[PDB]
Amino acid sequence: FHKIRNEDLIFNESLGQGTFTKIFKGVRREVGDYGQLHETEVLLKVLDKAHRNYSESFFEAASMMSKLSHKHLVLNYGVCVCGDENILVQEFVKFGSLDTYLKKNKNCINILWKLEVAKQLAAAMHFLEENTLIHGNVCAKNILLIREEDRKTGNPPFIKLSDPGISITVLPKDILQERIPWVPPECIENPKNLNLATDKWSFGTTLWEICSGGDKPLSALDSQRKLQFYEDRHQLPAPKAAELANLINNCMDYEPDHRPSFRAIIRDLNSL
């Protein structure tokens, strides 16, 4: 990663927190193309100082994905590791995370919008699959909305997939249990079962979110009941708008080897 000086970063409003991270809107002063000076809006992801031992994991996966440029993968500008901070400096996406957007626009998002966002997410995951790169945390909060749909000019929405964050292969077991049903059953049994197949399961969970107006699946279940949900081999309920329900269940297959490739997933989406 390119190293950015703390002096060139200005922290502004908080935009929430993640797993052992805090999120801020920021500005980066930089020299851009042709030597022009810019003050660029950025998203700053700050690793909690108390959790400095997770720094390697947060940055590694972000790094490996940033070695692969793709239109549906978020741009990272660099890192700031001056002083006692570990900061990821990322492109600022105008409309933020998709989960909050789905809730705030539920009475405006139709099946064609969902199918377009689903196709774009599958395209990003196919790219990752072909590069044998595991994401490990596909969820609606990690889908960033670059552009809204514009029925006036026929423009579809446009999304990017955000960075993975700290790997589930190093997180505490109680955090992994809280992330059921995004974390697949095999990874609850053994976090070292993290595999390409993991992302197919979480992709299914993410489609469920996209179809459910921002609801979080199994949110009414505490961690103990989420564990028993997997032990009893339950599936998620079909969303009210159930057009993607079969694909969701096909992806959320308790047998990891049976989950369809993203090429097949894309073919399925294109048939709807």
Ligand X SMILES: Nc1nc(Nc2ccc(S(N)(=O)=O)cc2)nn1C(=O)Nc1ccc(-c2ccnc(C(=O)O)c2)cc1
> Footprint of ligand X on this chain (CB under 6 A)?
15, 18-19, 21, 23, 43, 74, 90-93, 96-97, 100, 137, 139, 141-142, 144, 162, 165
Tell me how far CA of residue 49 lies from CA of 53, 63, 84, in angstroms. Answer: 9, 20, 7
Query: Residue 144 pairs with which residues in a beta bridge?
Result: 97, 160
Q: How far is the CB of 163 from ligand X (least distance, A)?
A: 7
Q: How far is the CB of 196 from ligand X (least distance, A)?
A: 20
Quote the radius of gyration of the chain (alpha carbons, Å).
19
Kindly tell me which of 51 and 126 has the beta carbon lying closer to ligand X.
51
Kindly tell me which of 215 and 243 has the beta carbon lying closer to ligand X.
215
Strands (E), the chain: 9-18, 21-31, 37-47, 76-80, 87-91, 143-147, 158-161
Kindly tell me which of 19 and 205 has the beta carbon lying closer to ligand X.
19
Kindly tell me which of 17 and 155 has the beta carbon lying closer to ligand X.
17
Q: How far is the CB of 137 from ligand X (least distance, A)?
A: 6
Q: How far is the CB of 175 from ligand X (least distance, A)?
A: 8
Helix, strand, coil content of the chain in percent (nearest 5)? 45, 20, 35
